[PDB]
Amino acid sequence: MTIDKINEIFKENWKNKLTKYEIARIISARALQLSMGALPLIDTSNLKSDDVISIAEEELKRGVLPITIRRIYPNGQVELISVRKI
Amino acid sequence: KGVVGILIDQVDMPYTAKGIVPDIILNPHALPSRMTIGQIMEAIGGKYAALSGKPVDATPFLETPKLQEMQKEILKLGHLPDSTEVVYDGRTGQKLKSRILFGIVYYQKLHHMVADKMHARARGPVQILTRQPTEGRAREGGLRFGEMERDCLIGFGTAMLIKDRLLDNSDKAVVYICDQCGYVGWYDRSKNRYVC
Amino acid sequence: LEIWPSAILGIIASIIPYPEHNQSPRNTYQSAMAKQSLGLYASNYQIRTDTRAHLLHYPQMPLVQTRMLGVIGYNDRPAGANAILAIMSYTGYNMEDS
Amino acid sequence: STVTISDIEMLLKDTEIWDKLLRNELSIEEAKKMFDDVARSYS
Amino acid sequence: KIDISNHELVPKHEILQLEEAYKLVKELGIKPEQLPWIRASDPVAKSIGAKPGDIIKITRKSPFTGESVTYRYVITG
Amino acid sequence: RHALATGNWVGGRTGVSQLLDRTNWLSMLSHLRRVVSSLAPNFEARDLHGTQWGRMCPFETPEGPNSGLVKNLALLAQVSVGINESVVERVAYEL
Amino acid sequence: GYFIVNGSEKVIIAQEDLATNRVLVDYGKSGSNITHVAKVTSSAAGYRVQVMIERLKDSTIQISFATVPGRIPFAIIMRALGFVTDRDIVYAVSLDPQ
Amino acid sequence: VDGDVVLFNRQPSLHRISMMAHKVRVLPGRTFRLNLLDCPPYNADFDGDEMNLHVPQSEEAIAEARELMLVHKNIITPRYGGPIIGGGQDYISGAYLLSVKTTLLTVEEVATILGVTDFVGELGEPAILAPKPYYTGKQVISLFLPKDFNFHGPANISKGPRACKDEICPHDSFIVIKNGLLLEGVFDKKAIGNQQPESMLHWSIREYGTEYGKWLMDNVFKMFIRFLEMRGFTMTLEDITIPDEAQNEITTKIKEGYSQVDEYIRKFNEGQLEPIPGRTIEESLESYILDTLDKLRKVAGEIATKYLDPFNNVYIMAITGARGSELNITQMTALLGQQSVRGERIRRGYRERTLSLFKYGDIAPEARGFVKNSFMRGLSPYEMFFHAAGGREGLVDTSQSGYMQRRLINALSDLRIEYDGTVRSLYGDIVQVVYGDDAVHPMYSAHSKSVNVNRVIERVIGWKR
Amino acid sequence: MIDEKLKGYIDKRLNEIKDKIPDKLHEDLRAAIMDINGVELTEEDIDRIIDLTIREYQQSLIEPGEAIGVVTAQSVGEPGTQMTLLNVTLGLPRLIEIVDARKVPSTPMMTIYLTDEYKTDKDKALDIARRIEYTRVENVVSSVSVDISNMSITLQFDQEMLKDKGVSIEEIKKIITKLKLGEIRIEDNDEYSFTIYFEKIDSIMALFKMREKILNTKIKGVKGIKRAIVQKKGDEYVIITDGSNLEGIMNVTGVDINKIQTNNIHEVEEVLGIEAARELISREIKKVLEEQGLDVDMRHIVLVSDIMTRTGDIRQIGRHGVTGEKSSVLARAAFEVTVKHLLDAAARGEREEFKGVIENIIIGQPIRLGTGIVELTMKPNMR
Amino acid sequence: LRTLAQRLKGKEGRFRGNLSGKRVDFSARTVISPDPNLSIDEVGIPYTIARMLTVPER
Amino acid sequence: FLPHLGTSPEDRKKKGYYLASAVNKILELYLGRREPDDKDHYANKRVRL
Ligand SMILES: [Mg+2]
Ligand SMILES: [Zn+2]
């Protein structure tokens, strides 16, 4: 119980889990930079759809993206989460 | 009142054992909560009027003929008195397990037609003052994205969607600011220099 | 003594068949919708110059009548047609006011 | 002075004491003593 | 005049020790005046003898957790 | 001509004259028998008064703000034209 | 029953309002100095003027019309119209002693 | 092209699901086509309504719209823990007619019903093998439930005497699901209807995901419509017509009520009527008359329900929760009852009488607005006048609501949930130390509950309980 | 029936999860598992139940970056458009009264509980209601006669009302004697009548003024209490009041001062404090929404109550409260379409810093809610 | 006349007419009709509207 | 004052009698011999054509 037990449960729950806003941000950034000329990190030969957003979704589902989320807590502590093969 | 949801060909319509096909199909769920018995009564009276060739008066409190006489005469002319029919599916040919009520009702077409109600705008002219899209279907148009839609977008948490709706597609512009006074300058385009 | 008990209505409420079997707000909505329907509005419409005008191609007079329809001349200038009506659930395209 | 001015000054003094304590320029006991002094002097 | 701390609408108020308040403000990453405020003339603040610069620990009744803890900062007025 | 063409009348009245509605036969017939109350307020002014029996139709009213304030004449009702008060006064005094 | 003005067909809509030259009485607003109110809207050939009559908690009747800012007592305004004695005013109001 | 993401909106935009992301499908016509299950979130209708469309133009905007605003991700509303998307009118009655225990189907009928879905596979053996091979509607419904789903609960049709409150019910009023097999009960408004928290559909969505809810709504809800098409569902005029003995009983009850009202009036005239506290005499007499007439209407409705067929289509539409109530059936079949204006009988009219047809000072039930006929039998001229007078004040039926919502939005727009779990303003001020009390989103709640422990117990050991 | 072995297994297996969920949820889970009867229960069943409970709680947590203020505002204001209506104020006008922080309600009301010795007696409750209700002279007078001949006012008293209020003619005479009228003279005309003779007054205007001065004189009762009603809830008798006076009623004998209720939030704030005030605010909003059949989760209401009591005082959400305390000039000028805010800012040389969401949308820059709280880093070399 | 301060206040002024809300491009409005054959994620679009509104694809 | 009764000095007694009748009506309302006039009664409404 740092401040309250509920806050500790909250921070323990979100320790190794991505929020929907982080997923949306990662997918949008990957799609934007993939439409600008980047090379896909997956096969992209037998995918159902060949648009950038679908490829970004598939690249996020199987961890190949070298992207890191930086969480800044209000007291200044920093947490880093990697989506590259977790 | 209602709007047309689909138009179905005569082959796909359900038909009676005489081959009669409805012009309009009404949902049974619209009647019980609105309690318009006069419409079912009018359907029965219209079927009677078409079968018998006799006048039907539906003046309030003084209706002639009465409903029971109408139903007896409908039975004597070769139809079921309760105004129901044996019906087959036009797509498969199989008889429905229930009898369906057929009748004749007077319908009216209102001047609210979708051919005069749809308008879209991709790009077009802008205001001379605000440099924002115009207004009205007479001009190229433009729908207003008000404060409540902005609140919906904020509630969903979509920053780039908010930007796309409210800046990129309405009045995006570029200005030049002096770093000492914060006033708006300009580009001279002839001497290739910034002037504040 | 009353001359005509149905003379408590107006000219548009006088076109409703069996109005005493309906709920009153529906009788009120009918009067609003009856002024927006398309038919024949004048016999000399082709030589007039109206800003906006409509014309139903094949108008019919109602089979279920009221005594006031012939008095006001509506059977000569009708604004509708008689449809074969079925009351059933079919394909789900007539749900909730369709 | 006036009640409002005394309230404003005591709020300012509490703010300064908290700022100095949070910067590790004071100990807990010294902060307690100063808080008590201000509270008693402005009661 | 009258004791009101026993009313059913009044939650429990407690003055917080300086070390505990210091730890709380450090672990929240805030200044003391960024908490919700309570006046020194509040009827329940006077009942416990709270002076400005203190932090009050309040325990309220909750339908989701049973008991809920809240903190207020004592101001002048 | 201006009074008939704009609808703004003498005495503060507005909307006295309107363009005749010719959408169909019933539209024109109903427009020629419309009565508008100058209030168009109180919830008691929108009530169906028992004195309206045989004079105004109980069903033909708009929906919304103008409900109960715009009415339509009943079938057999007329509006009085009036006579000189002096004749009736002389008859009453002689009576 | 309509007019053709500049080629357009114009209908005059009937206007419903209160009777003009009659007295209508009502109670005053609750918790006010006025207990009872009477109103007259006298209409001339070209203009109409409203006359208001109040009764206060003092059991006094006050007259108030358009072109005078204040309230005039009933007997004062009655004396200006040729009713000089109190008996004339009293018997002009009513014959009932109560 | 098909599959593009757009924003679809209906005004006024009161909550955030007034505008959601949709996938484009291009079809012939000049109209915006919308699924019938999507209407409750928009408060939409097909009376001539219009809606707006918006096409995002950038990659980031499209990605955000597809990730956060898609329709099936927003089945549960944030106002309370319940589904805002669900079945309507034909869906409920079709589900009831299909899931009732008397429905038997052949192989061809089963193939016709399942042809509107995505189902391909083995049907299993028919429920009945001899004398003829027959499938059951419950058996066909069970093909779409997960093979570990358990549910026990009452049906909507269990309002009346058919309620048994246990698994032994001969009326299909109690729903029993064990290991994804519908063994008892029917499907109606309380199992698949929209805006019903803690229903079977709600538990399915909560415990299997919103993608499962999307798959279920797109497959099983079409079967209900197809079965209505095969069975035939109509409304005739004999569904609301009662025999002569029912009318005679209603007439005798009306006579008894009128006698009671006359006795009240006589007691008032002789000065032997006691008042109710806080009200004068001649105001208590009105209350007594209104009570007597209300009881008369209730009794007449009960008689009319007793002497009507409990399996006609109007009764089916009423008991299952599709359309209509019992008051509608009573008014259409027994009597309208007393008409009122602002809680009082109809009085405004001439002096001491509403209409010139009545005597001076007559306060009998018919003189002041009691209708003893039904819509089926027709109203009298003065009964029609009274009915039109009673419903006048519903015709009058927003700036205050808009102003209040605007003030709330401008007061609260800057609050955010932090990684700490704290609610803070964008200027740093702390509002709540932890959101709510347990940091549980109302959208993910089990109808305001973080966890329903009884539901967990039913999930684990429901197949043997 | 759970045997002792399985109960011990349950207790052992429940003690290793005490830190994984809230205490109330743990208590509810323990109470629910012990009530399973008619089913032969197994250790694997207990394991599955506990694991599913923990997982279900973890799956319901709110996510950081959520714009919870907008969601709360939309969840509270949206049902406000669906509201379709002593006669206390209710619905949308009452909700507006609550959120606008009105000093006094349109229809004040109190609920007064009594002590144990006054709790179950009807006569004692009636006596309390009698002695707390505010009564004037005109509330017991049946007829008033004004005499012009001798400048005398005659008062006739209703015996039934005089008994009901517990008032006697002697104390009425004593109260009238204390008035400012002057040199008067009272004479009995009957057992329920007397006349004030005014041996001094001259005109009729002053006679009438004296008459309405007499008829408005207070006899008894606590100020502000217009009507008191005795109600039987269970075996207890409760007093329902048409007015509001917390200070006055708290001094009345037999009143339970730890259970007294009011709908006046400002009196409750002044007497009991701000936490009681915000609890009352939440209760009032919840009751107003619930009595109309509208389902709104309590967390939104609690957040609203917290936002309206943050500064130690009750503030309205509008111009003179929470919205007007915002530190953005442009947001205030947009909410209040007036331009005087910009003139004040120019006069005082204020500085606007673009921290909120509305101003950033006005100028056209991304907001810090939702996807704006996320910040990303990448390693491009990893192909 | 309409002056400097009149261009800023009101519901049609600068703030609430052009800053808080505005008219936008790539938008359409039409009557709605039912379709039980669509998914809950889908919306039916006319051919005319599909050919006028466009999506820019790199 | 009361233009519908005349605009000449000779027409003052008529105005006095009219005002006396109005005062009589309001006094009758005071003593409970009357009720407030119904403004929705069609005896009080006129239609201008
Ligand atoms: Mg609609
Ligand atoms: Zn410069």
Ligand SMILES: [Zn+2]
């Ligand atoms: Zn049963």
